[PDB]
């Protein structure tokens, strides 16, 4: 692993270029060696904030939200190098800051187009103690295709998303009008949704200092299956809490007993 750094204690200029330095190191292993590179950038928003910070001193009329008028092109000539070619392969994981939590902010907004997969995290989810705080209805991947991951993978995923969406819509309403009037058909999706919402959390191995829980890594089939069963009604008896901060579905079953008292 090679490392390159231009942290927050640096002047705008350094911040407007480290990504370039970093990316340049990576392009070498891609082309001149032809290897499989893994590129981690945290946080690419900083490249764009760097530019907005000197922009006025460069004598430019500001574009919207204070950004510089060349934001997109500035981002384009850069993002277009961070890429896999026929020579080598790059697997870039870029952290993207979202100013004021507003995903429509010209920066975060302008970056979606440069990605093949996006993991959108949300303070509203995090706030509930659900980590990783990924938003299940705002995260996407270009390979979420039956032709690529398979229909079992695909039907489960979409199956999980429908129910979370179905529950999102009801949330604001049972809030006020309560739950009695709801059809047993609909109070089961509230159930399953709340359990899935939890089964989606997981204790990371790099956050034991945070969660007080041993980190779990779940294999793709343990995942697909676990959800498949929740969706299938196979655990409507266990308590939600049993599904919170656990790895594989078996830990949810064990945790039920431990909670059983």
């Amino acid at each position: 692993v090679a490392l390159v750094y231009g942290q927050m204690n640096e002047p705008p200029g350094a911040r407007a270029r480290v990504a370039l330095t970093g990316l340049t190191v990576a392009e070498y292993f891609r082309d001149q060696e032809g290897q499989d590179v893994l590129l981690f950038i945290d946080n690419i928003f900083r490249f764009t904030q760097a530019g907005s910070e000197v922009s006025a001193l460069l004598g430019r009329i500001p574009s919207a939200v204070g950004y510089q008028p060349t934001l997109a092109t500035d981002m384009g000539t850069m993002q277009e190098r961070i890429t896999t070619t026929k020579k080598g392969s790059i697997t870039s994981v870029q952290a993207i800051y979202v100013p004021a939590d507003d995903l429509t902010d010209p920066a975060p907004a302008t970056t979606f187009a440069h990605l093949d997969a996006t993991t959108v995290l949300s303070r509203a989810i995090a706030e509930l103690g659900i980590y990783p705080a990924v938003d299940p209805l705002d995260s996407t991947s270009r390979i979420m295709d039956p032709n690529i991951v398979g229909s079992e993978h695909y039907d489960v995923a979409r199956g999980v998303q429908k129910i979370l969406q179905d529950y999102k819509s009801l949330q604001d309403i049972i809030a006020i009008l309560g739950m009695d009037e709801l059809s047993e058909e609909d109070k089961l999706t509230v159930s399953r949704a709340r359990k899935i919402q939890r089964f989606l959390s997981q204790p990371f191995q790099v956050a034991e200092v945070f969660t007080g829980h041993l980190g779990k890594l779940v294999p793709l089939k343990e995942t697909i299956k676990g959800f498949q069963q929740i969706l299938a009604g196979e655990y409507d008896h266990l308590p939600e809490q049993a599904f919170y901060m656990v790895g594989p579905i078996e830990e949810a079953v064990a945790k039920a007993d431990k909670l059983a008292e």
Partner: protein, 276 residues
């Protein structure tokens, strides 16, 4: 693309337009997709501000409306006197948080003959393609539908609009009359018929055969969860066994009283097969 200088991103749509005009003018037909007009607007805004022209709302130059109107007007249907050739344009606009009234989305909506509105909520709810049928529009309308389609499109459009009025009730319909309870049922089946996988566009004759199925009431007793499976297999069947009826529908351009009767049997026997 992303790394090409602003001016090339700016021009792209015109230079592609010219290319499609060669067909239009020569009695030939051409289709053009601008993906997206949002990014080109940005390219133009970038040059405008760097040349220091005055900035208006969203920092866009006063002539951004004129940049698209002069582009989207070059699409048109000529007269035989001119070759009868045409240029259809499918321009893409990216909205933000569904703000169809933001500046650029407002211009282009205001310039074009209709809009196909896509929605995330729909998408994640299982409606794919995510077309919001109530807000989508076609100023041209039926002046462009085939008689076959109209024969079906028309009542579908109507039960759907009707469902849309009642839909919200469903989830709390602790005791609705069977009048409206009927429209909820037609509602969800017709909706399931509009669903569609990607990369598999259908022949107008296949679309009416399937639409006919629910519109006529045949899938009303079928389970919502199965319509997707029904259509697929039903359509596999008639594309296999019945290419002579579809060829009729196709040719006759409509659903003759005959082919009508043949479809009735084809679906009432297939359905029977189906729930065995």
């Amino acid at each position: 693309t992303a790394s090409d200088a602003a001016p090339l991103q700016y021009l792209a749509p015109y230079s592609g337009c010219s290319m499609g005009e060669y067909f239009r003018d020569n009695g030939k037909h051409a289709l053009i997709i601008y993906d997206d007009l949002s990014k080109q607007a940005v390219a133009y805004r970038q040059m405008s501000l760097l040349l220091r022209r005055p900035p208006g709302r969203e920092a866009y130059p006063g002539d951004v409306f004129y940049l698209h109107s002069r582009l989207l007007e070059r699409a048109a249907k000529m007269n035989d006197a001119f070759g009868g050739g045409s240029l259809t344009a499918l321009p893409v606009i990216e909205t933000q948080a569904g703000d169809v009234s933001a500046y650029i989305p407002t211009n282009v909506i205001s310039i074009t003959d209709g809009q196909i509105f896509l929605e995330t909520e729909l998408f994640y709810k299982g409606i794919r393609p995510a077309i919001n049928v109530g807000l989508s529009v076609s100023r041209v309308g039926s002046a462009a539908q085939t008689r076959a389609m109209k024969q079906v499109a028309g009542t579908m459009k109507l039960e759907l609009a009707q469902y849309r009025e009642v839909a919200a009730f469903a989830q709390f319909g602790s005791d609705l009359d069977a009048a409206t309870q009927q429209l909820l049922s037609r509602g969800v089946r017709l909706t399931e018929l509009l669903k569609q996988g990607q990369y598999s566009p259908m022949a107008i004759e296949e679309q009416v055969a399937v639409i006919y199925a629910g519109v006529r009431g045949y899938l009303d007793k079928l389970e919502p969860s199965k319509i997707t499976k029904f259509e697929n297999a039903f359509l596999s069947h008639v594309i296999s066994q019945h290419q002579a009826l579809l060829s009729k529908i196709r040719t006759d351009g409509k659903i003759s009283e005959e082919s009508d009767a043949k479809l009735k049997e084809i679906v009432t026997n297939f359905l029977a097969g189906f729930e065995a």
